[PDB]
Design a protein around this ligand. Structure first.
Ligand SMILES: CCCCCCCCCCCCCCCCCC(=O)OC[C@H](COP(=O)(O)OCCN)OC(=O)CCCCCCCCCCCCCCCCC
Ligand code: HEM
Lengths: 400, 189
């Protein structure tokens, strides 16, 4: 697998690329700026700037931005999490010259027309009025609120309608001018790109970007609404983090676990996270599932089996992202790797960290993170038969 | 009969001190209320062992430590305390039969109690006049417990006669009339 080569410019912006023989490319800008860096007075600034970022910059007033990136034939894209913001373009490699200049405008020289600001406010607000339809997102934005009470990690990416309505260009300008620093930025490219050409384009454009205790609280939120047909319940404990080595032995544990829609998640933030399971079931069976889940976590903690570990190591092995997955998937990995680890971890190092995992250290790490821990519980729907906190806390351990 | 008592209750669930439908707020019992029953068991054992190990004869009668003599009858015969309320009633009614019947009714009046409920509110948490009548009922139950102890002579007898009259009149007459008045005060009747 070709190595990911990283350079660093005056601004501090990093320019990471991983050349591949695929023909198109996914060039993106990552920024270490999310809802965790907001201070409850600008709780929707990143989301609303993510809406405003494609509505024209000085150089591209009006629909120019979308038009050109449309003409070139590039499906631009963007997203915001609690810690990272990404603006990426998938385009024919030859178009890097413009895929990069366009990205430069989007990060700097952007224009937040107040007129547009008004509309985006309405857009965000109205969607939020309906964002309630995404029960799962709701469950996961409370599994965050009740687990990180009193911290900037409880607040959602979208923010409360309140802030959305109460936001102005200057505020946005601040978030833009405060959390868009060049040392906190990665220009990532994946696919048919040359690293020297991309470095020269980053020196030509984007060389102007200015250079400048999270806690988990074992708790419970229960939103009871009996008119909903199905119930969604998420139970999590404190994830190790992004950099913690044991994350890998925890991923194998998730691969061992894999009622209904019983997914499993290991969400990681800067030295924190949520490790757990989300399941949707008919109200009458919520109790059973919650118990089954526990029994399983407990199984790994005291009774793993090399065979199953293997099953888990292999599934993890087929999850690692690679040139095969495509440019975007890879870029995305390049941007997150340079933002979180500070380097791109190659797949050989991932394979080494997977093959060093055995059953004994898996049950040791699972006992470190699951056994006798206070979970965060978030339920939405007909959740009366969902057990309260003593029964779940008692199910977090075995007498035997 | 206690197993039948528990069954006839689970069909309906326990009541709450507000007297309202508690279906919106119910919790488990094992992890939540058991530690409460265990604590109550511990406190009851504390009172039982301080009754046994420190004052083993404050509730019994000394004359029970003599052997049974049919030729002598202890001059002061009193049934044990918890039978006293009944004892008072029996002594109060002049007629022997009357006493026996009233005595029985004393216990039975309770069974008769679910047919005397004339209020639209189940509990007495929001019913102050019937609360006053209830505490007057507890008061003259304590009075009847005391009278039983007292010997037959003035004025213990009259109190006994009144206390019994007041007991039956509060349970039979005063509480449903008070519940009607309380329903009238809330613009319900
Ligand atoms: C012994 C009686 C103590 C007392 O004053 O009564 C408390 C009152 C009624 O208690 P109740 O359940 O009727 O007990 C009857 C026992 N024969 O309890 C009630 O009035 C229930 C309805 C109102 C409850 C409000 C909270 C009352 C808390 C009382 C216990 C704590 C305070 C104790 C006194 C200080
Ligand atoms: C043999 C003695 C008795 C025993 C062992 C007994 C035991 C119990 C138990 C274990 C309960 C369930 C727990 C509780 O509600 O606190 C209960 C409830 C109840 N008992 Fe008794 N009981 C006895 C006598 C009586 C008597 C004499 C009455 C009537 C005056 C009575 C009326 C009730 C009622 C109404 C309830 C339901 C209380 C409620 O939930 O509102 N019991 N009993």
């Amino acid at each position: 697998v070709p190595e990911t080569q990283v350079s660093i410019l005056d601004n501090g912006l990093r320019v990471a690329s991983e050349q591949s023989s695929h023909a198109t490319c996914t060039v993106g800008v990552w920024i270490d700026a999310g809802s965790r860096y907001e201070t409850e007075k600008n709780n929707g600034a990143g989301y609303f700037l993510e809406h405003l970022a494609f509505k024209g910059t000085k150089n591209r007033p009006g629909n120019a931005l979308e038009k050109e990136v449309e003409s070139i034939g590039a499906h631009l894209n963007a997203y915001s999490t609690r810690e990272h913001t990404a603006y990426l373009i998938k385009a024919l490699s030859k178009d890097l010259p413009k895929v990069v200049e366009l990205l430069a405008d989007i990060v700097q020289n952007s224009s937040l027309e107040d007129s547009q600001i008004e509309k985006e406010r309405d857009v965000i607000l109205r969607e939020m009025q309906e964002n309630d339809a995404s029960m799962q997102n709701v469950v996961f934005d409370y599994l965050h609120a009740t687990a990180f009470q009193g911290t900037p990690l409880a607040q959602a990416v979208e923010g409360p309608s309140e802030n959305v309505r109460r936001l102005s260009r200057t505020d946005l300008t601040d978030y833009l001018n405060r959390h868009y620093k060049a040392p906190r930025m990665v220009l990532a490219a994946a696919g048919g790109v040359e690293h020297q050409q991309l470095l020269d384009l980053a020196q030509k454009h984007l060389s102007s970007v200015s250079r400048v205790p999270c806690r988990f609280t074992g708790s419970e939120i229960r939103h009871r609404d009996d008119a909903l047909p199905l119930a969604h319940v998420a139970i999590a404990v404190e994830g190790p983090g992004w950099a913690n080595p044991d994350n890998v032995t925890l991923q194998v544990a998730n691969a061992i676990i894999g009622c209904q829609s019983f997914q499993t998640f290991n969400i990681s933030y800067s030295d924190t996270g949520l490790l757990g399971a989300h399941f949707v079931c008919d109200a009458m069976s919520i109790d059973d599932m919650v118990f089954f889940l526990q029994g399983q976590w407990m199984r790994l903690c005291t009774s793993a089996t090399e065979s199953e570990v293997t099953r888990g190591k292999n599934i993890l092995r087929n999850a690692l992202v690679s040139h095969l997955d495509g440019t975007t998937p890879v870029c995305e990995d390049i941007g997150r790797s340079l933002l979180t680890y500070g380097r791109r971890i190659p797949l050989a190092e991932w394979e080494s960290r997977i093959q060093e995992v055995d059953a004994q250290m898996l049950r040791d790490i699972c006992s470190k993170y699951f056994y006798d821990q206070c979970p965060a519980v978030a339920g939405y729907g007909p959740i009366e038969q969902l057990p309260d906190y003593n029964r779940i806390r008692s199910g977090m351990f075995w007498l035997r | 009969l206690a197993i039948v008592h528990l069954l006839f209750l689970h069909e309906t669930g326990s009541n709450n001190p507000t007297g309202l439908n508690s279906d919106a707020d119910k919790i488990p019992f094992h992890p939540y209320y058991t530690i409460k029953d265990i604590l109550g068991i511990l406190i009851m054992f504390l009172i039982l062992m301080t009754l046994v190990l420190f004052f083993p004869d404050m509730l019994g009668d000394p004359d029970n430590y003599m052997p049974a003599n049919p030729l002598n009858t202890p001059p002061h015969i009193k049934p044990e305390w918890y039978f006293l309320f009944a004892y008072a009633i029996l002594r109060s009614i002049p007629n022997k039969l009357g006493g026996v019947l009233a005595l029985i009714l004393s216990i039975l009046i309770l069974a008769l109690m679910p047919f005397l409920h004339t209020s639209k509110q189940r509990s007495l948490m929001f019913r102050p006049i019937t609360q006053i009548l209830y505490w007057i009922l507890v008061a003259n139950l304590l009075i009847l417990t005391w009278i039983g102890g007292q010997p037959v002579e003035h004025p213990f007898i009259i109190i006994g006669q009144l206390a019994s009259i007041s007991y039956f009149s509060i349970i039979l007459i005063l509480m449903p009339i008070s519940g009607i008045i309380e329903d009238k005060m809330l613009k319900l009747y």
